[PDB]
Amino acid sequence: AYKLIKMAGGNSAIQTYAREDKTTQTLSTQKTISVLRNGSTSTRIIKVHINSTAPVTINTCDPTKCGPTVPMGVSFKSSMPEDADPAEVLKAAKAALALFEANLNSAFNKNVDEISVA
Amino acid sequence: AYKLIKMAGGNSAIQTYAREDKTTQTLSTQKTISVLRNGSTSTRIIKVHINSTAPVTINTCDPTKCGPTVPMGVSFKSSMPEDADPAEVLKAAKAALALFEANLNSAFNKNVDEISVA
Amino acid sequence: AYKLIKMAGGNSAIQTYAREDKTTQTLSTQKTISVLRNGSTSTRIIKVHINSTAPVTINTCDPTKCGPTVPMGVSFKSSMPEDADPAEVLKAAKAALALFEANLNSAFNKNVDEISVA
Amino acid sequence: AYKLIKMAGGNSAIQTYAREDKTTQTLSTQKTISVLRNGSTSTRIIKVHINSTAPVTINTCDPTKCGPTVPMGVSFKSSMPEDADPAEVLKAAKAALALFEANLNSAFNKNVDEISVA
Amino acid sequence: AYKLIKMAGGNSAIQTYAREDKTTQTLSTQKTISVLRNGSTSTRIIKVHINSTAPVTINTCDPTKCGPTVPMGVSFKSSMPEDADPAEVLKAAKAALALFEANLNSAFNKNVDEISVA
Amino acid sequence: AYKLIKMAGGNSAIQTYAREDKTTQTLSTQKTISVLRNGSTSTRIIKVHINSTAPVTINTCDPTKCGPTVPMGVSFKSSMPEDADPAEVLKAAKAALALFEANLNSAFNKNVDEISVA
Description:
The structure is cut from a larger assembly and holds six copies of chain A (118 residues). Chain A has one helix spanning 87-100; strands spanning 2-6, 14-19, 26-38, 41-57, 69-81, 114-117. With 118 residues, the first copy, chain A, is mainly β. At the A-B interface, β1, β2, β3, β4 and β5 of A face β1, β2, β3, β4 and β5 of B. β1 of chain E pairs antiparallel with β6 of chain F, so a sheet runs across the interface.
């Protein structure tokens, strides 16, 4: 139960947030608009990028003597024509993620031959 | 209300599925392992990549839904050293996605100053 | 009966908005400052530029409204040295626009010999 | 309460007017027709240009000893396919202008995040 | 009593404001973050910069009564590592400012053997 | 409550003080005068600089528990022509400082659309 407050940042397109408790855990959201034209017609391509990271100490069996840290991260990206419906690709993506997020650190990729979407 | 069946493709430690009824909607899951060495210490880095896309007919002039197709896609990526705990990173990422999910196709960026979690 | 929301673009001291319901209709406002030096004296010149455009499907043969799109646009520009009074210039410009507004698309020029103001 | 009478001018496309009271305040209206063809089809592009200017003396704090003058100007431009409807782009442009015309000389561009159109 | 309205700036790191009555009187706020890497531990260093200026005109007698304009400004700067306590340096700075504030425009300075802090 | 005792400085333009309790916490006051020659009239320009700092130690875990020391500081600067009135720029700067003061050590910043001045 915490909240991520917006950080001072240089870019206007990117919003950066840090966790109130641990200002080492951060999150970043960015939106990009692109233009793709066929002949005379032109359509907008909206791209979203959300990145949540925190540092994690490399050495589990060490005495935690400020061992060099590696970023641990979870990222989300979205690219779609304006006013398209991501509802179904999101449902599918979330269903797939549910199979992995238990084993997101365990180097074990189960052979799944079909994924059921709710 | 549907299921993603593994497509008749060569497994490359990358598993690609298509939706049973709409085989245009696809989804891919891969896990890879890297080795990060800092001095004497070496640690394994688990990297998951899930992708869920469908084609979208460009909003066109015809009453019939006919036009060039642009891919729309939602992608989730995850990189962390083995046996780390991404619980809080995932929680924050999911809260941010909850904020931006309706606006994934909006072409307008909502300026929020804090993101409440858990 | 609608509002122009500022689009998710990088502010360049130029503000670009799109219409909320019809995001094809856009509008841009910029203000710039110049310095005009005549001999010893230097004065600041304020320059405003407002642009309001929408795409227009070319009048075509099909019953469906399908054809190449040409931009239609109305543009207002204003340049004056700082603290000047453009009240009367604006008044005359507005009277002229009132005369020509119905004929902005006419391909016929109305020959008027006087323009009444205020 | 004045009127702009037509001036002697050289061009037939451009109508030039001067104010009766001050023949230093002037106004000019021009209409241009262009042709844009796709394949066999061809369409007219009607462009209107209205420019209202007056000279203004540079030096406010001077004794008004015929200081060199700079033109202060307000301009309007219109470009659209023949028989298109500028009604909405005009409404939007006028709504935007209303925010600026108070501060047309004051070098201050307020951050406006949305413009309401009547 | 007045309000500092936010001006439209291209840079998102700096927020600029102008007084509603006098748009010549302005104020800028900027926060920036620096990383100080000591060994394998990086610490965050927060710098704040507030500036409040307005143009003052130096009247000099002249056949043509226009004199130059030079800004008068009050600036505040701050720099400290994250989660440090500025309470006491603020109190001391404010007491010194209290001594000098009356005489900011006066070119007088007297030896002060001690400054009493609240 | 404490007293800033005057330290013994070689330069007479700058007066330096140290807190009686903590001689590590210091404060400097300096006033300087500049001449601005416009034609045959020279005008006096008063600049004041107050600085209040103290050393803060960044604790970083290490086999040998000694971390580096970096200063935290609050700075005030002022510059204006003689006999000008800073009352309003001071009020505005103080209101902005009042907003940012709590968050001087926090790395958070939220968009503020206006600052209300007393």
